[PDB]
Ligand SMILES: O=C(O)CNC(=O)C(=O)O
């Protein structure tokens with residue numbers, strides 16, 4: 001009989017200490033009045049401005065719209081990827097940084113100082129966690145250094161299509177069992193929970209279970225207005241969590257140390273520069289000339305081409321143009337990444353021209369093909385996929401406000417583009433060439 005425990009159970013606290021000690025609870029009374037007020041107003045102000053969107057994610061080969069509406073706020077340039085969906089931050093006024101609106105801007109600043117507070121609290125609890133055990137400081141710091149927060153909202157009246165928690169009888173899930181993805185290893189998660197206005201169905205909870213385990217009773221922690229909780233250290237790997245919906249509207253701010261080593265603007269721009277190092281860059285025009293046809297440089301060039309195409313452009317435009325409502329931060333850089341990408345289409349075309357010329361001895365030609373074939377095939381496949389993902393029956397359900405675009409995309413007739421969008425014919429011919437005997 002799979003069951004769960006709440007504070008009403010005799011064994012709840014002992015079971016908390018024994019099998020969920022890296023979960024920590026900070027009651028609303030630990031956070032100042034003024035911060036509570038400011039943070040709640042910020043939630044209401046972002047909601048009023050319609051800044052929260054259910055995400056069209058992908059899970060086990062299926063297109064699925066998250067019951068919760070969400071918004072990512074964090075360090076300018078930074079991204080958070082989950083369920084094959086890359087969220088772009090609406091930026092908060094971090095040091096040394098004209099893109100958002102008055103009220104919206106104010107709300108970001110507010111979640112910034114909320115971030116400062118939780119980070120200090122996270123550091124305290126981690127120091128205490130280390131002090132308990134055995135009965136570096138830089139590790140701690142880095143594992144409390146929240147660079148983003150994913151805000152969640154749900155009005156169970158307006159979103160009643162909630163699944164039943166299937167293992168412990170926790171009732172309705174606002175967010176189903178999961179691990180938070182794309183997180184720096186052993187990094188903490190801090191959560192401020194704002195409700196309006198077995199377990200009490202009417203009240204929001206966060207649920208926890210041990211991974212692989214539905215025999216250990218799950219824990220259901222009641223959240224009220226301003227209660228925060230923290231997942232410390234490896235809790236997020238060793239356990240799964242969910243959100244059990246109550247009956248009133250509720251928000252949360254989930255601060256994370258996103259693992260953005262390949263997930264920031266500066267990083268992708270640097271990779272684009274790396275790739276274009278192989279092109280004569282005296283002038284910006286269509287006659288792309290390449291400096292080298294060394295297998296490794298061409299492989300890299302085509303790989304980066306794929307990276308900016310599908311991890312940045314197609315992602316951004318698939319959700320888009322939707323965070324344009326809250327900010328114009330990404331307009332210019334996404335245009336730039338597209339200009340850099342269009343050049344890479346020029347580069348690919350120049351590689352194809354080089355393989356397709358008379359003088360090239362068969363041996364070097366085959367070198368080139370082998371270096372670029374994996375990338376071009378991944379290009380065709382990821383293009384089919386994204387194009388389908390933009391045209392699914394549920395993408396088309398979304399308002400024009402959030403209509404997914406399949407950009408960049410062009411027809412055959414389009415003279416402005418050197419290569420067709422569909423590479424089936426090209427990839428087929430390269431395969432045949434490599435098979436030539
Ligand atoms: O909203 C909460 O309390 C918990 N949030 C999540 O688990 C999440 O969005 O990943």
Ligand code: NI
Nearest residue numbers: 178179180241
């Ligand atoms: Ni989560």
